[PDB]
Design an enzyme around this catalytic site. Structure first.
Site, PDB file in Angstrom:
ATOM      1  N   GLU A 123       0.842  -1.177   0.000  1.00  0.00           N
ATOM      2  CA  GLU A 123       0.000   0.000   0.000  1.00  0.00           C
ATOM      3  C   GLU A 123       0.888   1.241   0.000  1.00  0.00           C
ATOM      4  OE1 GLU A 123      -1.975   1.198   3.666  1.00  0.00           O
ATOM      5  OE2 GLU A 123      -3.859   1.419   2.568  1.00  0.00           O
ATOM      6  N   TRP A 151      -8.424  -1.369  -0.768  1.00  0.00           N
ATOM      7  CA  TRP A 151      -9.200  -0.314  -1.414  1.00  0.00           C
ATOM      8  C   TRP A 151     -10.227  -0.753  -2.451  1.00  0.00           C
ATOM      9  CZ3 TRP A 151      -8.595   4.758   0.037  1.00  0.00           C
ATOM     10  CH2 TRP A 151      -7.545   5.006   0.929  1.00  0.00           C
ATOM     11  N   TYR A 176      -4.429   9.107  -1.146  1.00  0.00           N
ATOM     12  CA  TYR A 176      -3.132   9.521  -0.618  1.00  0.00           C
ATOM     13  C   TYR A 176      -2.047   9.757  -1.658  1.00  0.00           C
ATOM     14  CZ  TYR A 176      -5.018   8.712   3.998  1.00  0.00           C
ATOM     15  OH  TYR A 176      -5.774   8.797   5.142  1.00  0.00           O
ATOM     16  N   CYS A 235      -8.175  10.149   6.901  1.00  0.00           N
ATOM     17  CA  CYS A 235      -8.082   9.937   8.340  1.00  0.00           C
ATOM     18  C   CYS A 235      -6.679  10.330   8.797  1.00  0.00           C
ATOM     19  CB  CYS A 235      -8.344   8.477   8.698  1.00  0.00           C
ATOM     20  SG  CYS A 235     -10.051   8.025   8.543  1.00  0.00           S
ATOM     21  N   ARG A 253      -7.106  12.508  12.375  1.00  0.00           N
ATOM     22  CA  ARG A 253      -8.378  13.095  12.778  1.00  0.00           C
ATOM     23  C   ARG A 253      -9.352  12.103  13.397  1.00  0.00           C
ATOM     24  NH1 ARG A 253     -12.476  11.804   9.953  1.00  0.00           N
ATOM     25  NH2 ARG A 253     -12.404  11.110   7.773  1.00  0.00           N
ATOM     26  N   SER A 254      -9.349  10.874  12.894  1.00  0.00           N
ATOM     27  CA  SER A 254     -10.223   9.821  13.379  1.00  0.00           C
ATOM     28  C   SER A 254      -9.584   8.436  13.231  1.00  0.00           C
ATOM     29  CB  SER A 254     -11.539   9.852  12.610  1.00  0.00           C
ATOM     30  OG  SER A 254     -12.345   8.754  12.988  1.00  0.00           O
ATOM     31  N   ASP A 300      -9.930   3.982  14.273  1.00  0.00           N
ATOM     32  CA  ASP A 300     -10.575   2.763  14.708  1.00  0.00           C
ATOM     33  C   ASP A 300      -9.394   2.075  15.407  1.00  0.00           C
ATOM     34  OD1 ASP A 300     -11.143  -0.028  14.690  1.00  0.00           O
ATOM     35  OD2 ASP A 300     -12.031   0.046  12.677  1.00  0.00           O
TER      36      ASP A 300
HETATM   37  O1  LIG Z   1      -5.548   4.267  10.170  1.00  0.00           O
HETATM   38  C1  LIG Z   1      -6.763   4.373  10.001  1.00  0.00           C
HETATM   39  C2  LIG Z   1      -7.491   4.966   8.848  1.00  0.00           C
HETATM   40  C3  LIG Z   1      -8.912   5.049   8.816  1.00  0.00           C
HETATM   41  N1  LIG Z   1      -9.593   4.590   9.852  1.00  0.00           N
HETATM   42  C4  LIG Z   1     -11.068   4.851  10.056  1.00  0.00           C
HETATM   43  C5  LIG Z   1     -11.404   6.164  10.774  1.00  0.00           C
HETATM   44  C6  LIG Z   1     -12.904   6.034  11.004  1.00  0.00           C
HETATM   45  O2  LIG Z   1     -13.051   5.045  12.086  1.00  0.00           O
HETATM   46  C7  LIG Z   1     -13.498   5.482   9.689  1.00  0.00           C
HETATM   47  C8  LIG Z   1     -14.040   6.621   8.805  1.00  0.00           C
HETATM   48  O3  LIG Z   1     -15.241   7.352   9.335  1.00  0.00           O
HETATM   49  P1  LIG Z   1     -15.132   8.966   9.531  1.00  0.00           P
HETATM   50  O4  LIG Z   1     -14.011   9.105  10.473  1.00  0.00           O
HETATM   51  O5  LIG Z   1     -14.816   9.566   8.225  1.00  0.00           O
HETATM   52  O6  LIG Z   1     -16.314   9.639  10.100  1.00  0.00           O
HETATM   53  O7  LIG Z   1     -12.220   4.859   9.075  1.00  0.00           O
HETATM   54  C9  LIG Z   1      -8.929   4.005  10.930  1.00  0.00           C
HETATM   55  O8  LIG Z   1      -9.491   3.477  11.859  1.00  0.00           O
HETATM   56  N2  LIG Z   1      -7.577   3.918  10.987  1.00  0.00           N
END
Ligand SMILES: O=c1ccn([C@H]2C[C@H](O)[C@@H](COP(=O)(O)O)O2)c(=O)[nH]1
Ligand SMILES: O=c1ccn([C@H]2C[C@H](O)[C@@H](COP(=O)(O)O)O2)c(=O)[nH]1
Lengths: 316, 316
Positions: free
Chosen positions: B60, B82, B146, B198, B218-219, B221
């Site tokens: 990736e 993806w 990206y 993210c 920003r967000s 998981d």
């Molecule tokens: O390294 C990474 C990249 C992306 N996501 C996630 C972030 C969010 O949990 C989800 C997208 O939903 P929004 O944040 O856009 O609302 O994908 C991760 O967990 N980790």
């Protein structure tokens, strides 16, 4: 005490701080990657260990909120923070038919006569910006500054985006979003900017009816810069919150290059020998709601009892 | 142990985690504002408490480094991360003359028959992308991803900027800069993007001959996302460092909304009952230097002894 994180950050740069060169050829003690938080429900994080001019902080933030980039507003407000930048543009211009000015700032430090000369030419520049409308439009408009980055992002389609306006509506209609981000960084402009945004980007977050804000500051001057920064963005967190009918949460300051100029070491030690008094209280006009319409008189600061100011030279 | 910060972050979201709704209508335990650091000199932060596919992470990152945005490269590499995004574009298209597919992902969870149908249509889409050159150019190009954000930022002047390329040269000629920033956030595109970045922005820092990197996410998981993220950017910190003849420093992961989906709680607890083994070792081909020219075979991972993988559903 509310401002502890700051003193902690300060103490740290002294202790773990690794020397590092920089642009304004002076030395710095730097750290990389820091994050501190301030629970805005406990008070306003305006420093009591040293007097910070809240008036200046207040009028600057409004100037940004108006999406304004002309220095005239600030001057009308006795604010001169951004003065140098417009003055410099003026001096590098064909019209500047005055004395030797190239490097006015750094020179004034060890002025051969400069002091008055610079300080008077500056008085002239400002004075005109305040009155000669056409002069203001020409040498008084900085252009790409926070006000335009936040509220008139120039798109590839010659249009303009009000990032802040949009994020505020977002907060109201989708408070649980993770995309409440306003950005001051444009890959297109930084290669030719006088000063790329130190306050690179900020994210909003809503939870349990409280609003929080996280700022990412790519670079910071621990002594002179941070005190205002914390004050500025905490104020914004209140302002936006007031407008959305939310409670205030935490303000989080994250850092890239946090540094202390070598010529500030004694002064900071002075500060570190002080004991924080209780933090002040912010009061926003209850009648007004659209912060884009807020005026100075709508922001009161209650119970600010600080230690005398600390003077330290601007490293250049 | 190297991966402790992650487990710490995990444990924390459980304990201080405040419930919070989200887009994929599932629940989340969220925290706001976190920062963790990994000293890359101690080893590679690829998790040993659960098996992470380094092959996927590796292919990736190269795809990004090539400024590529077409899914064909990934598929040629058995990488399908993806896949959904291009497939979705395909299905919403005039040409998609197949079965019911709207909401394929969320539906597959409680598939009425979907499983095979979806999984086969997908096999078809991919297969074509791999062979039908014109199909690849049409439904296999994601566009703003990206690779294009990092290496072909679209300017208002219809030109293109290689942020990463420029930052790398910068590092070489001005290692002490505080403007070594690459940005994936475009105020112009996010209002109409399928998935705004993210991994919002990252800053480089050089000191004492070592390279460091800080990422602003920003967000996130915590369960499925973070493990790859730490691996991906630590790899980049090595790659860029290798190219600049620098030593590797720290990787710093800062967070906006760090969350754990409610349907991942048991699994994470499982992980938290494991003891980290020593971290693996990264080996980069000594002969090659221009990372933009790096191939899979130029990146070796030594001594990765992990605990069996943990399976958990993707919340949608
Ligand atoms: O390294 C990474 C990249 C992306 N996501 C996630 C972030 C969010 O949990 C989800 C997208 O939903 P929004 O944040 O856009 O609302 O994908 C991760 O967990 N980790
Ligand atoms: O809140 C702020 C805003 C700006 N600056 C500083 C950051 C740097 O110390 C200097 C600009 O130099 P560069 O970072 O651009 O290299 O101005 C601060 O200290 N604090």
């Amino acid at each position: 005490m509310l401002e502890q994180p700051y003193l902690d950050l300060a103490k740290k740069v002294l202790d773990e701080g690794h020397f590092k060169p920089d642009r304004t050829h002076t030395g710095t003690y730097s750290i990389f990657g820091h994050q501190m938080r301030f629970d805005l429900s406990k008070g306003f994080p305006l420093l009591t260990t040293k007097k910070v001019p809240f008036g200046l902080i207040k009028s600057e933030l409004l100037w940004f909120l108006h999406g304004d980039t002309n220095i005239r507003f600030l001057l009308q407000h006795r604010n001169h923070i951004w003065d140098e930048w417009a003055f410099e543009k003026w001096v590098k211009s064909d019209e500047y038919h005055g004395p030797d000015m190239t490097d006015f700032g750094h020179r004034s430090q060890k002025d051969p006569e400069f002091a008055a000369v610079y300080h008077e030419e500056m008085a002239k520049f400002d004075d005109r910006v305040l009155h000669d409308d056409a002069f203001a439009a020409k040498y008084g408009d900085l252009g790409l500054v926070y006000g335009s980055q936040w509220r008139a992002w120039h798109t590839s389609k010659g249009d303009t985006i009000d990032q802040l306006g949009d994020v505020i509506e977002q907060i109201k209609t989708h408070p649980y979003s993770r995309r409440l981000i306003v950005s001051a960084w444009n890959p297109e402009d930084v290669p030719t900017m006088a000063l790329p945004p130190c306050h690179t980007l900020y994210q909003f977050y809503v939870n349990d009816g409280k609003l929080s804000l996280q700022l990412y500051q790519r670079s910071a001057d621990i002594f002179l810069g941070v005190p205002f920064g914390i004050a500025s963005y905490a104020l914004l967190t209140h302002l936006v919150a007031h407008e959305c009918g939310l409670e205030v949460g935490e303000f989080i300051h994250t850092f890239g290059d946090a540094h202390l100029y070598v010529n500030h070491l004694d002064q900071i030690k002075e500060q570190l020998s002080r004991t924080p008094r209780p933090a002040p209280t912010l009061q926003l006009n209850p009648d007004k709601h659209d912060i884009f319409d807020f005026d100075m008189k709508d922001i009161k600061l209650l119970n600010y009892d600080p230690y005398p100011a600390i003077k330290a030279p601007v490293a250049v």
